[PDB]
């Protein structure tokens, strides 16, 4: 099924679509459309009804033991009441009792489920696609889900293409059609007629493909299913040891109650209490609630990422976020404001201050002469920016243009001295101007002096002032052209340093009035022809701009710096602005030197200087180019604080692959589409959520909202807190497990009453199931967290001997005692003091013994005995949850004679919690207490 | 250096202009928290060393709270009738009562959401603003439940102190604790302090959303925004929750290292620095070079 | 895993926490006991009324079986209630004060004295009596005692009357009166508190003649003349009843 529009026209196709080529149609017929074509392609998938979901949560995992006990139990009271008349309902309680117990626990586990997806797929709106339409006669950039059949669509580099689209207009678009195809070759799209076949027929553009280059608009032909996509259609480490630890403790519980199963058989059990209480213990002892403990712990992290700016793409990227070492990022609009401002000029050999702003426009100097108009005059002719309409009341600080920042910065400096640059660039007449591109380095454009001169023809250019110096021979000093000679290059040389060693961008302008002779007022202008004497003009001034460095930059270099993460900055700048502004963030720091710099410093040339006493670099991009593996190893082995200034995006790759080589886990900044196989070569790319283009987002591990580098620290300090939290997590779901085996060992071995029976087992671990999801939801960011060396990724567990004892030999048996001493009080407080229960068990435990003796010497009979067992065993329970539920809300706060209550058991916990306080031990597992 | 004690409306509001307005250059308007004023907190901070090349080139208006200032009298009943709302309200006279035009907040606490409502309610006087330790929500239902069952059997300084620094400091009790407690319990007018400190926590949750592409967005903050909190800080959710519902172009997070209570007494040679690029960024003072630069 | 001096300093580790923990455990468990009172139960409500106990108890889930003619076969029974008896003979509550009859012994201060029970209450199945108590003639005896409750005021007149379910052809002769329990005794104060007190008892011969020899009964005993002392019950079957089977082999 491929039938296209390709072989139709340009003039029918305003019939097919109704649509105006260069205005299209009107937002009332697109949303007309939207009301009755419906979304956009929206590839509606398919769905569970979620009740399959709830059912699957029930009986699925362990619970299907508890089912069969709840099976066994009511066999086994329908077996009594059908044989013999005046049943006891006991059978039918228990079995009652234990599926109470299993819907209860799947209810749990299927909201702890809900809550986790639904804090999951909030992040598919946080940055919704988009697509560039010019419905209404302005680009607009509506959603992509609102595009309808027929609206014009203009795609650029690095945007996805919204819908099928048949292009009417291109400049040079290719797209990547690897997602249709299995070749990732960039084929071309062109508004011609290539094959009659669809799918290569160069002038249709497919739904879900990426075009890499150029520009290109074209009409929407397929919106919906109906697209030529829509027709058609391993693990982590964290993962890793957390489903081991649960086969380990599963086959140890499996074990354990295998043991109680045969013990309790030699202790004269009914064949039910025996094949009942193994069932309590092995789904008692078994961790269930713990991959829904780490999916919520990792849940929520990303969530709190979110919400500084960090917008997390998948569950693997957030452990592997906290376990970073290097975050190789670029400098501007993610180390750098690019809000840039024009502080300095040099004209007329003295370096003047841009400050202007409302008080002194004429900072340093009012109005001078022809240098600095010529100089105005450059600078608002070769601009192609302009303000925006609806903005003539605003201050000229406080208004909007539109174009590069530069250009911006530009406008609004000489826009402040000057006066309505709107005015001057009108006054005069812009006829050519070449587009800029990083291969000449300058942009020419060709215009006409009203005042005196009238040529026809201008040679108002600017460009980098290393380079445009090379070919304006002349120089403008007091307004009269002079020869420049080498005293002239050095002031300027010496005038470059100084301004770009603040930190600045610092342009050239020169400018030439061209003879009549040679070209006459009829001429026309080629780019492939010379014509113009592209050489040969004359120098006028230099003009500077800071771009200042992000408020939150060099507090996330600092942090970065204590916390042992290498940051290295990939600039696409002249290595001493590099430099200034790496010094000026913290990446070079204080101390630390360049090898120029301790040349300098020493008076010594730089050849002598030895490169191990610099432990700060600046390679230069055209280098990078000529070192081997070795010794681009060796340079970021050795200099600890690296910068690559003038480095090309495609060197990102090779700079990742050299920083991967140590075993480090390196981060980077996409913004781009050739940066785009280094987001897939690092471990956690990171893209750009407002500069950044579709690919790179596409292609990223990691969004930042705010394009700030400092988020990106952000992000690595929230998700180094997932490493302790989860063993906190596995620590809380572990300590459960000895007041529950505890009792029935103490009984066997001490022969006393059971202080604990199976159902009331169950209870205990019904209700401490959700104490490691509650703790994660209420906690607090650990101090000092960003003070630590990274982790090691596989030299670092989870589970440790040392967690492990801390969870099941302390804490555990803390717990224990306190619900051991809760059923000694209610013994002791009947008649049974503490001291007569030893040996008790046999004549307790008898049916036939009705004359069992207190200490006060009263007798009680099997029945009376056995009440009070049972609000025994239900206060044990009862102490138990409501100690562990205590002793959370208050660590996570301090960091008659009922007081046998819960009282007791959280008392002790402080007692021997301060006594570990006491001892300090060691690195430290004192926290836990 | 002048100091008018404009009136207006609910009050009488004393402001201490420390400087001299530069035509219609912004203003820097900063407002305290609760259990201090200005000369506690701000006049540890806009006289530091770093600070003084910012303070030159701009203006600074050093307003009082309504019975915070030093010197006051009291009431018998009170009654401390401007709310949030209100306390913002009356703003916009002390800006035209100095012939003022724009200002860039500084907001600590419930000056910091005194300035956002302020900012809230008149976009186009208010350039931008810092807000350290800004709160956009109310007490809520535990926070709020905490609130009236531990202050009622606790003083109201200690209460300040609670509220201000973390309680790893308060239970560890430092020098700047107490050098602090000492300026809270005297220098200060309890009888409107304790009504003060109550209309703070009768507040209503400032209105302010996340873009999110979406025309029936809530409104919020236009102006550029950076929002200081240490990290070791009682309000570090607060700022994080305010961090985000906010335009991510515009505001930035700026939650400081090795700090906590008060980034403004603490570290200030952190927040100076992130003060300089805040306001470089938004095109002033751009010729003041980089300050690990500038000792080279 | 090797290591022995890790091993060695775990285990110490270990041995010093354990006993820290031990001995707060310990602390806590002297100091619930010094809240507690040592002469008479804190709480009372769970043991409202009093059960009813036979004596001795047999092998195999109160069962009495024994044979006619083998003396090893009773002999169990036999030196048990020789030495359940033994303070009930006359040699040893010379010391215990005599009783009125019929009102309850209500005693104040440190007095605390007990009434005595003759052992000739019981007939025929006293130890004064034939060395065996019912067997090798034919006619076993088996005790009836009821559980000892502290402050315990039984209202009425306290009988047991055990009637044999076996149609009643092996008559049961139920000893002590018609089955009454003087109610001299019944204000029992607990050990402690009450020195040398002797339950009463009440003994029950089951007539097993050689003509209706081996079978069983099933002599169901209960309390029938007090209200306070409840008897009916659906979960407990020894509250104010009991019910056991006597077999005679051969
Ligand atoms: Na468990």
């Known amino acids: 099924v491929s039938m296209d529009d390709h072989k139709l026209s340009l003039d029918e196709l305003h019939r097919k679509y109704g649509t105006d080529l260069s205005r299209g149609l009107t937002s009332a017929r697109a949303a007309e459309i939207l009301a009755r074509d419906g979304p956009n392609a929206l590839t ?48 039918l309680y228990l079995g009652v009792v234990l599926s109470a117990v299993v819907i209860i626990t799947g209810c749990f586990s299927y909201y702890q489920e809900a809550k986790s997806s639904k804090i999951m797929e909030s992040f598919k709106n946080m940055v919704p696609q988009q697509a560039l339409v010019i419905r209404n006669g302005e680009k607009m950039s509506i959603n992509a889900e609102e595009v309808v059949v027929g609206d ?30 299995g070749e990732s070759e960039p084929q071309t799209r062109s508004p011609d007629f290539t094959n009659e076949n669809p799918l290569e027929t160069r002038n249709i553009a497919f739904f879900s493909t990426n075009c890499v ?64 209480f193994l069932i309590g213990i092995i789904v008692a002892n078994v961790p269930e609630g713990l991959l829904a403990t780490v999916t919520v712990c990792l849940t929520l992290t990303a969530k709190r990422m979110a919400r500084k700016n960090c917008l997390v793409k998948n569950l693997e990227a957030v452990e592997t976020l906290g376990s970073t070492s290097t975050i190789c990022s670029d400098k501007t609009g993610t180390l750098t404001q690019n809000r840039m401002t024009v502080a300095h000029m040099w004209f007329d050999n003295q370096i003047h201050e841009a400050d202007t702003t409302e008080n002194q426009s004429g900072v340093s100097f009012d109005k001078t002469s022809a240098t600095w108009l010529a100089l105005s005059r450059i600078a608002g002719l070769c601009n192609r920016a302009v303000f925006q309409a609806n903005q003539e009341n605003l201050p000229i600080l406080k208004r909007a243009v539109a174009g590069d920042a530069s250009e911006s910065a530009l406008l609004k400096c000489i826009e402040l001295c000057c006066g309505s640059v709107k005015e001057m660039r009108e006054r005069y007449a812009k006829i050519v101007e070449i587009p800029f591109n990083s291969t000449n380095k300058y942009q020419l454009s060709i215009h006409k002096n009203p005042n005196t001169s009238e040529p026809q023809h201008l040679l108002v250019m600017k460009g980098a002032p290393e380079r445009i110096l090379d070919r304006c021979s002349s120089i403008l000093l007091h307004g009269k052209e002079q020869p420049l000679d080498e005293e002239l290059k050095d002031a300027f040389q010496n005038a470059y340093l100084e301004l770009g060693g603040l930190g600045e961008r610092v342009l050239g302008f020169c400018h030439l009035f061209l003879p009549d002779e040679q070209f006459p007022e009829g001429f026309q202008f080629d780019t492939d022809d010379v014509n113009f004497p592209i050489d040969n003009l004359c120098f006028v001034g230099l003009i500077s701009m800071i771009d200042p460095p992000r408020a939150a930059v060099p507090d996330a270099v600092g942090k970065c710096r204590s916390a042992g993460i290498k940051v290295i900055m990939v600039t696409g700048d002249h290595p001493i602005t590099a430099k200034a502004i790496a010094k000026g963030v913290g990446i070079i720091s204080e101390g630390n030197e360049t090898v120029e710099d301790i040349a300098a410093r020493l008076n010594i040339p730089v050849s002598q200087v030895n490169p191990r006493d610099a ?88 969004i930042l909202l705010d394009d700030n580098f400092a988020s990106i620290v952000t992000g690595v300090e929230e998700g180094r807190l997932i490493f302790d939290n989860l063993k906190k997590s596995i620590a809380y779901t572990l300590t459960s497990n000895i007041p529950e085996i505890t009792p029935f060992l103490i009984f066997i071995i001490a022969n006393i009453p059971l202080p604990l029976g199976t159902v009331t087992i169950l209870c205990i671990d019904l209700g401490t199931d959700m104490v490691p999801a509650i703790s994660l939801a209420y906690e607090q960011a650990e101090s000092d967290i960003m003070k630590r060396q990274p982790r090691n990724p596989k030299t670092d567990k989870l589970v440790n001997e040392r967690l492990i004892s801390m969870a099941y030999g302390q804490i555990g048996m803390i717990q224990a005692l306190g619900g051991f001493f809760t059923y000694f009080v209610i013994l002791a407080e009947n008649g049974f003091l503490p001291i007569h229960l030893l040996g008790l068990r046999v004549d307790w435990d008898d049916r036939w013994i009705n004359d069992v003796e207190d200490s006060y010497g009263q007798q009680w009979t099997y029945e009376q005995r056995k009440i009070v067992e049972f609000t025994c065993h239900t206060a044990f329970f009862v102490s138990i949850v409501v100690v562990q539920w205590a002793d959370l809300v208050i660590c996570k706060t301090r960091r008659t004679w009922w007081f046998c209550a819960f009282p007791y058991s959280l008392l002790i916990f402080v007692y021997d919690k301060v006594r570990k306080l006491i001892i300090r031990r060691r690195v430290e597992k004192e926290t836990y207490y | 250096c002048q100091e008018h004690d404009i009136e207006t409306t609910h009050g009488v509001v004393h402001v201490t202009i420390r400087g001299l307005p530069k035509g219609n250059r912004p203003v820097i308007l900063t407002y305290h928290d609760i259990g201090l004023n200005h000369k506690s907190c701000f006049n540890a ?31 018998p009943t009170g009654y401390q009738y401007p709310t949030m709302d209100e306390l913002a309200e009356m703003l916009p006279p002390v800006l035209t009562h100095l012939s003022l035009k724009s200002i860039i907040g500084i907001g600590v606490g419930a000056g910091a959401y005194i300035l956002s409502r302020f900012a809230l309610n008149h976009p186009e006087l208010v350039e931008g603003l810092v807000l350290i330790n800004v709160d956009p929500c109310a007490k809520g239902w535990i926070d709020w439940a905490a609130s009236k069952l531990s202050g009622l059997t606790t003083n109201v300084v200690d209460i300040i102190l609670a509220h201000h620094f973390g309680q790893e400091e308060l239970q560890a009790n430092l020098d700047l604790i107490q050098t602090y407690r000492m300026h809270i319990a005297q220098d200060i007018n309890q009888d409107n302090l304790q009504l003060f400190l109550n209309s703070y926590n009768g507040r209503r949750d400032l209105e302010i959303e996340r873009p999110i592409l979406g025309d029936n967005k809530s409104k919020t903050l236009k102006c550029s925004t950076l929002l200081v909190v240490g990290d070791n800080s009682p309000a570090v959710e607060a700022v994080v929750e305010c961090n985000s519902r906010l335009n991510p172009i515009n505001t930035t997070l700026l939650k400081m290292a090795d700090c906590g209570g008060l980034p403004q007494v603490v570290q200030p040679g952190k927040l100076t620095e992130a003060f300089k690029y805040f306001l470089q960024g938004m095109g002033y003072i751009p010729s003041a070079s980089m300050t690990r630069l500038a000792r080279s | 895993g090797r290591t022995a001096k890790s091993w060695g300093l775990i285990l110490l580790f270990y041995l010093v926490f354990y006993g820290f923990l031990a001995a707060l455990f310990s602390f806590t468990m002297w100091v619930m006991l010094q809240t507690l009172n040592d002469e008479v139960p804190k709480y009372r409500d769970q043991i409202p009324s009093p059960g009813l106990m036979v004596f001795p108890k047999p092998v195999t889930a109160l069962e009495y079986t024994f044979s006619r003619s083998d003396p090893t076969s009773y002999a169990g029974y036999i030196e048990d209630l020789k030495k359940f008896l033994k303070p009930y003979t006359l040699e040893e509550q010379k010391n215990l004060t005599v009783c009125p009859d019929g009102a309850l012994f209500e005693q104040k201060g440190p007095v605390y004295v007990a009434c005595q029970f003759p052992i000739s209450l019981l007939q025929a199945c006293s130890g004064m009596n034939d060395p065996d108590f019912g067997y090798s003639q034919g006619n076993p005896c088996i005790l009836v005692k009821m559980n000892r ?31 009454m329990i003087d109610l001299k005794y019944f204000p029992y104060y607990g050990k402690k508190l009450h020195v040398g007190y002797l339950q009463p008892l009440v003994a029950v011969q089951v007539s097993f003649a050689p003509n209706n020899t081996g079978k069983e009964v099933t002599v169901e005993c209960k309390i029938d003349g007090s209200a306070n002392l409840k008897s009916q019950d659906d979960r407990d079957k020894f509250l104010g009843r009991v019910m056991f089977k006597i077999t005679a082999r051969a």
């Open chain 1, 44 to 91: 509606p998938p398919p769905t569970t009804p979620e009740w399959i979901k709830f059912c699957r949560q029930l009986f699925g995992g362990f619970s299907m033991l508890l089912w069969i006990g709840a099976i066994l139990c009511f066999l086994a009271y329908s077996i009594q009441a059908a044989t013999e008349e005046e049943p006891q309902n006991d059978n």
């Open chain 1, 152 to 181: 014009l669509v203009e795609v650029k580099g690095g945007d996805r293409i919204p819908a099928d689209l048949r292009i009417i207009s291109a400049n040079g678009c290719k797209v990547d059609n690897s997602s249709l195809t």
């Open chain 1, 213 to 276: 280059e150029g520009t290109a608009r074209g009409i929407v032909v397929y919106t919906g299913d109906r697209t030529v996509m829509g027709r058609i259609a391993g693990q982590t480490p964290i993962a890793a040891e957390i489903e081991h630890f649960i086969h380990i403790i599963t086959g140890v519980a499996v074990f354990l109650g295998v043991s109680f199963f045969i013990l309790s058989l030699i202790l004269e059990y009914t064949w039910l209490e025996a094949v009942i």
């Open chain 1, 615 to 702: 432990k700060a670099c600046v390679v230069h991009g055209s280098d990078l180019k000529d070192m081997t593996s070795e010794q681009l190893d060796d340079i970021l082995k050795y200099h600890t604080e690296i910068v690559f200034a003038r480095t090309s995006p495609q060197q990102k790759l090779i700079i990742v692959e050299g920083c991967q080589r140590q075993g480090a886990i390196v981060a980077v900044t996409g913004d781009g589409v050739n940066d785009s196989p280094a987001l897939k070569k690092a471990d956690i790319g990171v893209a750009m959520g407002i500069a950044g283009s579709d690919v790179s987002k596409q292609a990223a591990d990691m």
């Open chain 2, 45 to 75: 901070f806009f006289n530091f060393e770093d600070m003084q090349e910012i303070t030159q080139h701009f203006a600074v208006c050093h307003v009082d709270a309504p019975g915070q200032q030093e010197g006051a009298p009291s009431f």
């Open chain 3, 149 to 179: 409750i502290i402050g315990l005021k039984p209202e009425g007149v306290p009988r047991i009357d055990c009637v044999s379910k076996n149609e009643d052809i092996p008559n049961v002769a139920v000893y002590p009166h018609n089955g």
